[PDB]
Design a protein around this ligand. Structure first.
Ligand SMILES: CCn1c(-c2cc(N3CCN(C4CC4)CC3)cnc2[C@H](C)OC)c2c3cc(ccc31)-c1csc(n1)C[C@H](NC(=O)[C@H]1[C@@H]3COC[C@@H]31)C(=O)N1CCC[C@H](N1)C(=O)OCC(C)(C)C2
Ligand SMILES: Nc1nc2c(ncn2[C@@H]2O[C@H](COP(=O)(O)OP(=O)(O)NP(=O)(O)O)[C@@H](O)[C@H]2O)c(=O)[nH]1
Ligand SMILES: [Mg+2]
Lengths: 168, 163
């Protein structure tokens, strides 16, 4: 059967992890705020001509439960690290997520994509140049997205699969 | 302190009555919101709404009577109101406390503890406790799940204030 890829979506509260995932899976924009406990989704897609199955874990941004992330980081094969371009604090939180994944995986070479979400909004506080420079220092792709307009949604998840394929 | 009740139903079948003491002596604004939403005297409130999130080992959460999807609800003071105080703690089963989406975002959603949840102290306003019918809350746990999705519709079929 087609290869399955275990993807994990992480980032601070309210950056759009669920909105991005529900756009990918259900082609629908969630405008209301429904903070996540834990949700899983499945979707088959074609990436570079090869059909595969995305198994996506949508995680909670709650800082109170940061010590409970280790198990899903052990199981995940690739990570979408999401911040919001109008939320400087969520961008600062990214470093903490990457360090946590690196520590759990004990590796500098973990499939990851940096995602700057909410690019439809006029209230930008994180420059594209800052985020490109951070992704470069990590050695990972950076993609700007909007769960509202669907800009970059497929591309962010597809790029993460391409990163997994290159690593294994 | 005033007492209110919920008559709980499961897929429309009666389950039983839970009663609550509301700590008006320590959290009067928060107790009053819950009391008025339980009588329905503002023309809106808990009657007919569901417990949308039930997580065995932890709590039962409900109170979204405006959107019926876990994101809604409103207080009698406006859509949301401030955290009154954090005097009371989440000390064990039966504690009644306000749900929120961050600081100063109390509406109508609430939760009932089925265990001690001390990590919520200082973040959720405790304002009452179960007085009678804790076994009804315990019975609601078998309709819950790890992430809180329920397997049957758990509703507040009736609610009100007791003498
Ligand atoms: C990490 C997993 N995980 C856990 C958790 C944690 C633990 N521990 C922590 C404590 N450890 C001890 C110190 C050693 C033991 C292991 C074990 N297993 C789990 C669960 C079962 O693993 C799936 C939780 C939990 C809670 C959240 C997100 C993830 C969570 C979360 C998201 S949103 C919120 N919390 C607050 C929420 N806000 C809204 O709903 C807003 C909606 C919009 O605006 C109105 C309305 C709200 O007010 N409440 C009212 C209060 C209880 C609260 N919901 C809720 O559901 O808590 C669930 C739970 C299980 C108690 C905690
Ligand atoms: N304008 C705009 N709003 C967005 C975008 N993505 C998410 N939002 C909004 O931001 C809020 C939070 O989104 P949500 O997906 O629930 O965030 P989350 O990261 O999953 N939060 P949690 O960690 O609590 O589960 C919602 O009101 C949602 O509609 C986007 O690209 N553009
Ligand atoms: Mg979410």
């Amino acid at each position: 059967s087609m290869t399955e890829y275990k993807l994990v979506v992480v980032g601070a509260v309210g950056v759009g992890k669920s909105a991005l995932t529900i756009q990918l899976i259900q082609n629908h924009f969630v405008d209301e705020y429904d903070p996540t406990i834990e949700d899983s989704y499945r979707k088959q897609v074609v990436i570079d001509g090869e059909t595969c199955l995305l198994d996506i874990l949508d995680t909670a941004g709650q800082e109170e439960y940061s010590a409970m992330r280790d198990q899903y980081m052990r199981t995940g094969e690739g990570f979408l690290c999401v911040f919001a371009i109008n939320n400087t604090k969520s961008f600062e939180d990214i470093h903490h997520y990457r360090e946590q994944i690196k520590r759990v995986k004990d590796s500098e070479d973990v499939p990851m994509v940096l995602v700057g979400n909410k690019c439809d909004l006029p209230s930008r506080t994180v420059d594209t140049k800052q985020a490109q420079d951070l992704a470069r220092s990590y050695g990972i792709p950076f993609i700007e997205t909007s769960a509202k307009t669907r800009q970059g949604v497929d591309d962010a998840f597809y790029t993460l699969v391409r990163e997994i394929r290159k690593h294994k | 302190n005033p007492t209110v009740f919920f008559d709980i139903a499961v897929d429309g079948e009666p389950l039983g009555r839970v009663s609550f003491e509301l700590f008006a002596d320590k959290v009067p604004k928060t107790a009053e919101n819950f009391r008025a939403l339980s009588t329905g005297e503002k023309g809106f409130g808990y009657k007919g709404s569901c417990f949308h999130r039930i997580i065995p080992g932890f709590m039962c959460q409900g109170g979204d009577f405006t959107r019926h999807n876990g994101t809604g609800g409103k207080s009698i003071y406006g859509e949301k109101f401030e955290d009154e105080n954090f005097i009371l703690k989440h000390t064990g089963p039966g504690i009644l406390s306000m749900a929120n989406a961050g600081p100063n975002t109390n509406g109508s959603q609430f939760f009932i503890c089925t265990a001690k949840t001390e990590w919520l102290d200082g973040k959720h306003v405790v304002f009452g406790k179960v007085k009678e019918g804790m076994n009804i809350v315990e019975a609601m746990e078998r309709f819950g799940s790890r992430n809180g999705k329920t397997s049957k519709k758990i509703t507040i079929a009736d609610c009100g204030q007791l003498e």
